[PDB]
Design a protein around this nucleic acid. Structure first.
Lengths: 93, 93, 93, 93, 93, 93, 93, 93, 93
DNA sequence: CTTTAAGTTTAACTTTCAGTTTACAT
DNA sequence: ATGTAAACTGAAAGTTAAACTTAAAG
């Protein structure tokens, strides 16, 4: 339905500390994408649960992270869109 | 760069109270899209500033709302993408 | 009820520093009309709040600027009359 | 160039203490319109010079009051438009 | 109470430089009667303030010029008697 | 040609120290009207020559005092109009 | 204190060219008594200033002419006694 | 260090109801391998928690299932060895 | 079919009390491997029958212990793989 | 952001002094 | 007829009050 420029998105995220760290949390010590529950993310970055959780929620809405039911809770991984956004940043650095 | 299905997004937002209300806040009494600062939104919906602000920020990242500098602060309006998402909901109702 | 000559008005405003700057404040860097709260205007031009606010108020009375409720405060945009007055000035310059 | 509804204007002025009193100052004890310098007006109503003066200036821009040079200063009288606005109020009362 | 011959008065004024110029000061470039403060008159004719002011005062006593309060000062216009006296002179010239 | 109300004139003169004293100077110790040259008047009242002389001149224009050549100078007496004005004051007192 | 025969006086004056002309100088072309300064009299009759002035002075002493201050000089008119003396002469002629 | 015959293993598992069902639990409705927490597995098959959990633990020791930390708990997926064992069974059926 | 690293296995077992004790139960007072029925093992270590039995079963599946029919029941001994795993532990200690 | 107070600037009110002319006296 | 004195007119020299604007405080 709608075409998306991945460079603008990455540009926007880069200008917003919380979005940026929420995104990068899913990338591990060896550069590999990983699974995380909401609590892990909030613990990993130094921002409050409300901030981090709301960001996680919106990023799943945006389709940047995936949600999958696991136990009676949920886990988050970067979507293919998520991984592509992360790539723009890696190239900068 | 990336194609987007507007129905899935709307589906995701509809399953998340905060995202949904943050989005609809921009639609006024007469059905018209309107401008809002971050404070207006948080005051309008009954959720905490941290939740609402983080959601506003991520929605601008996603390209659902636009940011424009005004005074030395910012204001938010739905993008064309934002308006299209709102339309799916209007059709449901 | 009453017909108005837009040239005389513009002539009057041009002979009055405060009116003139209050009017032009609403025109942005790219020539586009923008929204502003009362504080933005007073901060933007180098005149005191009382002067600027009273001018804003009277200009809304005159129908040169519009008022719209937003949060529990108000915002100002040029009316169609406002835009037409601004055009006379642009043509001079 | 532009048509004006006198009822809306009067409606706007009635919702603004300063505009209203600045306007009515020109109507005397016997209901007759009178001439006033800027100082007279500010002295007559209980608002600060900056407020009153800026209002007087904008009302002359709007064409509600007339300016005429007298000595090396100026004096203000209601225009025909001014008188017509005053009439709407008289009818209310 | 007392009848007045306008020709004698004009005759008297014509034989007195100061009276004459004080009177004519109120007649403008286009032949139209105008308003003036005391200072304007003294500046307009080349006689000292004391002379001009005393003449203005006496001419208001005589009923040749009118006084009207304006700001917290006064302004002078020819009365109907004043205008009639000016007419005798215009006819000479 | 023109009818005159003697009460208004007296009212005007009574509100003007110089006019008033210039007029009364012609009334002597015993209530009798007397003759005076311009210098006598200025010496008699405590105002400057320019003020007093200009007032004398205008009062002769107005027809309140008479002028008569005497030596190669002039002398002033109240006219019948002058005497009638003086009477209004006497009645007050 | 002392009674005076007006016929003897007139008889005496008639026998003295200077007295006679000094007296008659005050009677004008139309038979009317008039005001004169000392210089006027001496100019009017063909006798020297010293003669005429001394005569004027003595005639004021005698009470035949009146003196009145006018400017910072004096003027002379016939007294009632003066007029009565003039009448005896008019009757002769 | 040590070579393994996948057929013998599958043969052994097939002769043991619990092992077999613990293994197959990870294969979903569409034949796809899935993630599961320990509780999911015990709920899915009709054997007691102690039995199922101990089996899960030993199967991770054996290298048949993988463990990954997620929240502050763990999740299990078949290893490549696990998938290969499952394939022998699929071929039987 | 599949190669196995004996160090990883031993590492996994060492992080799991039950697996570890089930394994070591087969090593006797003098360091010699011994035969045991399922009941012996559960009695020897202080864990419940269900836990111990399920572990024994899975360890036979894994090929770590051997099963041999004896009477109409079964007995367990470490396989060569079992003995090799036990050796890694002995070396640690 | 608004109101009040203080300071500065502009405008208005004119008064005083000097010179010239006229009148009076010697 | 001339000289001196007085009066009047004209020209030159400022102070006070009011209004407006700006700054500070609430």
């Amino acid at each position: 339905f709608y075409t998306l420029n991945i460079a603008e998105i990455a540009e926007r995220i880069g200008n917003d500390d919380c979005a940026y760290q929420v995104l990068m949390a899913f990338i591990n010590e060896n550069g590999e994408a990983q699974m995380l529950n909401k609590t892990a993310v909030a613990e990993m970055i130094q921002l409050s649960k409300p901030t981090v959780f709301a960001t996680v929620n919106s990023f799943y809405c945006a389709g940047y992270i995936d949600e999958t039911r696991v136990g009676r809770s949920k886990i988050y991984t970067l979507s293919d869109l998520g991984v592509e956004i992360v790539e723009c940043f890696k190239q900068k650095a």
